[PDB]
Amino acid sequence: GKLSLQDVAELIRARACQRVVVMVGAGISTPSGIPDFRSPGSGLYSNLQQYDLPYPEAIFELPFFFHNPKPFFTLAKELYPGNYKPNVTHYFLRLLHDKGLLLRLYTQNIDGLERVSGIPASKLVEAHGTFASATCTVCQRPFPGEDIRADVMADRVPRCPVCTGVVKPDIVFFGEPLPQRFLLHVVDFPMADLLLILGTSLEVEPFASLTEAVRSSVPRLLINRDLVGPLAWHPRSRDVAQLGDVVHGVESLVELLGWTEEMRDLVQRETGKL
């Protein structure tokens, strides 16, 4: 009686799963043209030239950021919410929100496309920060994220109006604590009757451990290229894995839910807005 993708589709349409929680990673942002490292990017990818990183992850580590913050702000310019548009996976999650089936959407991404697609902030946990807010690394004064937008887009480091220190967008670097809003998972995952895992290799803690927090009878559906994380080495009898292309996998589920017609219309209504 193991579950298939169609069975999960039947549980939503049957309304046996009404509290859907979703975990997303870079896999759902690749189709929108967003650059990734572990999988080269544009010419801006190898803009490391002139920048002597000890390793690519130093871009998200404070000690090197103090030394040279320009590598980060080069990436920030690229990923800044405005140059890229949501794809079908993002709109599949708003359509899930518009039907009142989404409890929370937990995201590792910082491209801000989750809110560009229409999901309100109250339904999002941006576990790895956001460009919506910023903080001076010297005097710790917070600022709204848009006070530094012009500086980043003009390739000039944003400076603090009070102490001239470097203003850093509230992006979680490695070795930094996650935002306390991440603690909503303590209540949200037990409350969930369905978990969706979209486009992530589950290599970033403590976000990856979230796959364990849903109760033992809750289906865990993985739409991903690879079988990763606990759904690989700690499986549960109610797990499902639609392995393959994330877009193709979401298209399949949408197809099995009979939402195709509504997805077409929603994507057309959202892309037409200027």
Binding site: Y55, E57, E61, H128, V172, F173, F174, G175, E176, P177, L178, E203, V204, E205, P206
Partner: peptide, 9 residues
């Protein structure tokens, strides 16, 4: 004095 981590650091 840490938490966010990925395979490497």
């Amino acid at each position: 004095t840490a938490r966010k981590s990925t395979g490497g650091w």
